[PDB]
Amino acid sequence: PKLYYFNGRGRMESIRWLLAAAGVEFEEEFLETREQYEKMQKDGHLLFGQVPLVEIDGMMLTQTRAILSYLAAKYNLYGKDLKERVRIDMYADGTQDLMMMIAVAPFKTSYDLILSRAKTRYFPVFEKILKDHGEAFLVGNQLSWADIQLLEAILMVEELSAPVLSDFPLLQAFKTRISNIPTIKKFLQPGSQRKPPPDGPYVEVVRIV
Amino acid sequence: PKLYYFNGRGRMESIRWLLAAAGVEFEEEFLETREQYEKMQKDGHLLFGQVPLVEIDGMMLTQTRAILSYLAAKYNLYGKDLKERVRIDMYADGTQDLMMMIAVAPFKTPKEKEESYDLILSRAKTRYFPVFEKILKDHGEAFLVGNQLSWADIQLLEAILMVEELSAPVLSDFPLLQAFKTRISNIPTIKKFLQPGSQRKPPPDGPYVEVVRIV
């Protein structure tokens, strides 16, 4: 893999996460300023003219959720059956939603709502999905790319309001046991590919391209 | 299947299309007003509390893109290999983008409305079509991915008509795509679904906006 995107989280972060959890080493190449983008464009790399771009298996993939489902299947993180995979995809969607609210929030002049939506909407669902089947994992007793989604979502909400999650026991226990999976652990250790929350001129590298 | 959603296009339209093209008969049940939604919610049907809802194979599937990929793979419209599938999925996402610009444009106020439509046109005429034109040119072929009807073809068509309704010319400058329209509109299942007494649903008007602001 060779990921192309900014030196920030955005739309790639969930991909880095999925790679990392797969135990797959990747290289990046940051879009710093304006000219870089216009070059990739006109060298025929960016399909519909927009990043992410992820060079992998000789192909230059380019639309976000497209790439996730290639990865998540290549490296066996989508279930066995369509019924398992649809549960994954469903979960993966909600989280995906939640995060993207956060990811886009810095560009405004919402956070208190994302909190209402996490505390009241998303977490309670995941909490009883874990409760109702007890199990260590979300779908079918195996590490699925949905678990990798939920965790990333948890810490992403946690970064805005750390308490947040106490009320959800099974989830606290989830966070622990999944953070302690070799690949996830290594990806969370201080000197990592993992990227920060959006700050200042992340927002303005991105407005300048 | 039993689709739940409004009596309008929105997020379900692309699902009805995919069902239709599969040669699969479906039943609907329209969300008319406020109370109906709050009932489905608290009877434990809506996972993260939001429609679409599509009852199928004994399961109550509920998040858009999650249902499309169940359908599109059950009824063999995703490729044979991951490399085909990802070409589908990549194409599926662009169209998906284009349409959802249109689908959400009615809920704005007027300057935004025009400024968005005229842009959707720029984006269709200058970004998405020219890409799909040469994908057809370069490989000549009748179909988008691997000489078979894939759910991407079903996506491109729906997108074409959807852009066409705003500005019918639009597409002259894309020969191969015109021909694309003709041949795919003439596939038995697509043909039937386009005949005037159909499940297919109209563009957003006023009312649709209103029912949807009132649930």
Curated annotation (Swiss-Prot), chain A:
Reactions it catalyzes: RX + glutathione = an S-substituted glutathione + a halide anion + H(+)
Claim: Magnesium is one of the keywords in the record: no
Protein keywords: Acetylation, Cytoplasm, Transferase
Enzyme class, first EC level, given as a word: transferase
Domain GST C-terminal: 81-198
GO molecular function, one term: glutathione transferase activity
GO CC list: mitochondrion
Entry PTM: The N-terminus is blocked.
Record bears the keyword Glycoprotein: no
GST N-terminal domain location: 1-79
Catalytic activity, EC: 2.5.1.18
InterPro entries: Glutathione-S-Trfase_C-like (IPR010987), Glutathione-S-Trfase_C_sf (IPR036282), Glutathione_S-Trfase (IPR040079), Glutathione_S-Trfase_N (IPR004045), GST_alpha (IPR003080), GST_C (IPR004046), GST_superfamily (IPR050213), Thioredoxin-like_sf (IPR036249)
Transmembrane residue ranges: none
Top-rank lineage group of the source organism: Eukaryota
Gene Ontology BP annotations: glutathione metabolic process; response to caloric restriction
Binding sites annotated in the UniProt record for glutathione: Y5, G49, Q50, V51, T62, Q63, T64
Family, as annotated: Belongs to the GST superfamily. Alpha family.
Subunit-structure text: Homodimer.
Biological function: Conjugation of reduced glutathione to a wide number of exogenous and endogenous hydrophobic electrophiles.
Comment field (misc): On the basis of immunological and kinetics data, GST 5.7 is distinct from alpha, mu and pI classes of GTS. However it has been postulated that this protein may be part of a distinct subgroup within this alpha class.
Record-given protein name: Glutathione S-transferase A4
